[PDB]
């Protein structure tokens, strides 16, 4: 309605802040969300997919993966494992791989020039080290005069029974801007955060785990590398969900008194806005019913004989056009539920919540 009845009361951009989070995804920080954009958490403010993406995973998802096999696979690697890469890490080989953001590095796959210091994959391939304790002798001719394989004997991401389970390819140099901890320790004041030397790992796993102000925890049992990324429980929400919340947490009385003040004292402009905002709050607050209801979580369905299914001519049936919209709503709703269960990639849930939203219109 011109005056947004939910915008006038919830001081949100009366007509556009709503449109923004209602139908698509422009998240409104509902409760606390401690970490910065540059300034404090936006109590009642709205951010984008992109900056929000930059809030949860950490500031930088850079996936620079190299060409061919030798040049960049070498510059990247010598400076990749644990070597805290600074910003503008100028990797040296094609063009100039440019790692322009923050804290530690994880490179992804190797090919076959020289094999040193890498994880358990190749170990079983060249039996010597996984079979017995040969790896040392594996360095080949100067040992007569942790990993360190032969001078250059293996090629791809394979399993060597017969070379049968394989995969010949690329090598990502994905900089993960996060802080990597190898030997955390146990201090019991709050419950034990993060990790113990090597034995106990109390951190939740490579998914969601909140330790100190930094809040994500990935785990790499290769070295005891408890990858701790940094954002917190930022209650980011979009759609009716975020407005049902916001509408419950409001004591109209407070807004009635505040507006009383805003109304008579400051100059016209903002006080003028408050008097038009005091109307709805007072009505809600007078003999009128209470305002959490503007939200619909349970859709009434008009009578059956009122939306007939009639036999017209031969086989022609005829029904009240409402039944097509009702199927709309019902199907979407159910597909929604099924898509939440089956597992939920984010875009697809939104895309549907969107469709469902419109249907309810």
């Amino acid at each position: 309605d011109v005056p947004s009845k939910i915008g006038t009361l919830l001081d949100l951009s009366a007509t556009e802040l709503e449109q923004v989070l209602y139908f698509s995804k422009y998240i409104v920080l509902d409760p606390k969300g401690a970490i910065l954009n540059g300034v404090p958490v936006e109590k009642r403010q709205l951010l984008t997919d992109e900056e929000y993406r930059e809030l949860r995973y950490g500031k930088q998802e850079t996936y620079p993966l190299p060409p061919g096999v030798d040049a960049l696979v070498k510059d990247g690697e010598e400076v990749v494992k644990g070597q805290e890469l600074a910003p503008g890490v100028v990797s040296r080989l094609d063009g100039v791989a440019l790692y322009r953001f923050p804290r530690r590095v994880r490179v992804e796959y190797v090919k076959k020039e020289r094999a040193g210091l890498r994880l358990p994959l190749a170990a079983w391939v060249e039996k010597e080290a996984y079979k017995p304790g040969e790896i040392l002798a594996e360095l080949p001719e100067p040992y007569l005069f942790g990993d360190k394989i032969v001078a250059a004997i293996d090629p791809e991401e394979e399993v060597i029974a017969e070379a049968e389970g394989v995969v010949h390819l690329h090598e990502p140099a994905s900089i993960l801007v996060v802080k990597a901890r190898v030997y955390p320790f146990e201090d019991d004041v709050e419950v034990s955060t993060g990790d113990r030397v090597a034995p106990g790992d109390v951190l939740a796993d490579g998914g969601k785990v909140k330790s100190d102000v930094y809040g994500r925890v990935e785990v790499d049992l290769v070295r005891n590398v408890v990858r701790v990324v940094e954002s917190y429980d930022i209650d980011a929400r979009m759609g009716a969900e975020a407005i049902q919340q916001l509408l419950k947490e409001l004591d109209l009385e407070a807004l009635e008194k505040e507006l009383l003040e805003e109304m008579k004292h400051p100059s016209r402009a903002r006080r003028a806005k408050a008097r038009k905002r005091l109307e709805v709050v007072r009505a809600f607050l007078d003999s009128g019913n209470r305002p959490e209801w503007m939200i619909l979580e349970a859709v009434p369905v008009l009578p059956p004989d009122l939306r007939p299914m009639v036999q017209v001519d031969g086989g022609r049936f005829a029904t009240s056009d409402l039944n097509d919209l009702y199927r709309r709503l019902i199907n979407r709703n159910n597909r929604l539920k099924k898509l939440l269960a089956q597992g939920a990639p984010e875009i697809i849930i939104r895309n549907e919540k969107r469709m469902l939203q419109e249907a309810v219109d």
Partner: protein, 345 residues
């Protein structure tokens, strides 16, 4: 702002920032998905917990907080205390089995970077089953559900990659959706193909006679057991519901619904009949005795239209006895004080 474009920009944007590498990234995530399964089963093994419980606890720890579990499925799992207890045993699993907990999680997450990357696959496919009677967004979405279906079964051991795989697992999901939701009145997949066949046959027959086929053609050309009663029936089921609301006559405010009469409602002549019929029948029923009149009055009037089973202890011959002798005296005086004859129907 008009929907299709936003979604398209949305998942095309994320694909843009992350397609999956032909091999490396489809293989990587696949392998993690599987070890997740292998991990969750072994987890049930050691915990006595149902693989369903292990699956929802790891999903809550990876996909979302109390928020997710409480609103979607209503509260059977306690929001905080319950799943937390489950994660606790997961921790207590020593070096050996903790491994699986840490794997299950990463596997679940892996499952997601694979589903994101292949949303363009869906849309491109879904872009062709467009004019069936489903919304593009509805279509892509069911197809999306199919791709997730594919993720469950992909065996990376068998070398073929996810592309050709999602293609089938999606095309199935979409063809079902189109058959299950595209109509206002649910028809089986057999009656759908049947209709398509009938339609296609009518097409071939519209190829040469210059006679939109008498349904004689249709039966022949379709095959074995097709006859006229059939095709007439089929095309009658084909036609879609016309609108109870449609322009009428010399198109103006006349809406189609005022034209259609009503049939359960007693139009005043019927309420009047019921009154007289009830009072007159009720007067007669009183001038009989209860036993076999109430038996046939209730047996007929009260419940379901059983001579033997109609009367209590008393057998058939007292039934018929009274049935037919009270029934006739009731008629024969109803004949004298004629109240009932004018047929009230």
């Amino acid at each position: 702002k008009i929907s299709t474009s936003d979604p398209v920009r949305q998942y095309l944007h994320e694909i843009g920032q992350v397609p999956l590498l032909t091999l490396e990234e489809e293989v990587e995530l696949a392998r993690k998905v599987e070890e997740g399964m292998e991990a969750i089963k072994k987890l049930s093994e050691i915990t006595g917990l149902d693989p369903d419980l292990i699956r929802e606890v790891v999903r809550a720890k990876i996909l979302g907080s109390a928020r997710v579990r409480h609103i979607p499925g209503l509260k059977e799992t306690l929001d905080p205390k319950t799943v937390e207890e489950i994660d606790q045993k997961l921790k207590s699993l020593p070096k050996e089995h903790k491994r699986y907990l840490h794997i299950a999680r990463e596997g679940e997450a892996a499952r997601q970077h694979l589903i994101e990357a292949n949303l363009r696959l869906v849309v491109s496919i879904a872009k062709k089953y467009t004019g069936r009677g489903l919304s593009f967004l509805d279509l892509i979405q069911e197809g999306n559900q199919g791709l997730i279906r594919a993720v469950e079964k992909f065996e990376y051991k068998r070398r073929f990659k996810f592309s050709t795989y999602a293609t089938w697992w999606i095309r199935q999901a979409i063809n079902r959706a189109i058959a299950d939701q595209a109509r206002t009145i649910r028809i089986p997949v057999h009656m759908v193909e049947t209709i398509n066949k009938l339609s296609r046959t009518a097409r071939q027959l519209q190829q040469e006679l210059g006679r939109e086929p008498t349904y004689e053609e249709i039966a022949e050309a379709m095959g074995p057991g097709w006859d006229a009663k059939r095709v007439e029936e089929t095309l009658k089921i084909a036609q879609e519901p016309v609108s109870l609301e449609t322009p009428i006559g010399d198109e103006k405010d006349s809406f189609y619904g005022d034209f259609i009469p009503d049939e359960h409602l007693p139009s005043p002549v019927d309420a009047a009949t019921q009154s007289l019929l009830s009072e007159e029948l009720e007067k007669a029923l009183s001038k009989l005795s209860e036993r076999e009149a109430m038996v046939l009055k209730l047996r007929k009037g009260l419940i379901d239209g059983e001579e033997v089973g109609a009367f209590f202890g008393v057998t058939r011959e007292r039934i018929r006895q009274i049935e037919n002798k009270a029934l006739r005296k009731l008629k024969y005086h109803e004949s004298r004080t004629r109240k009932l004859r004018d047929f009230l129907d």
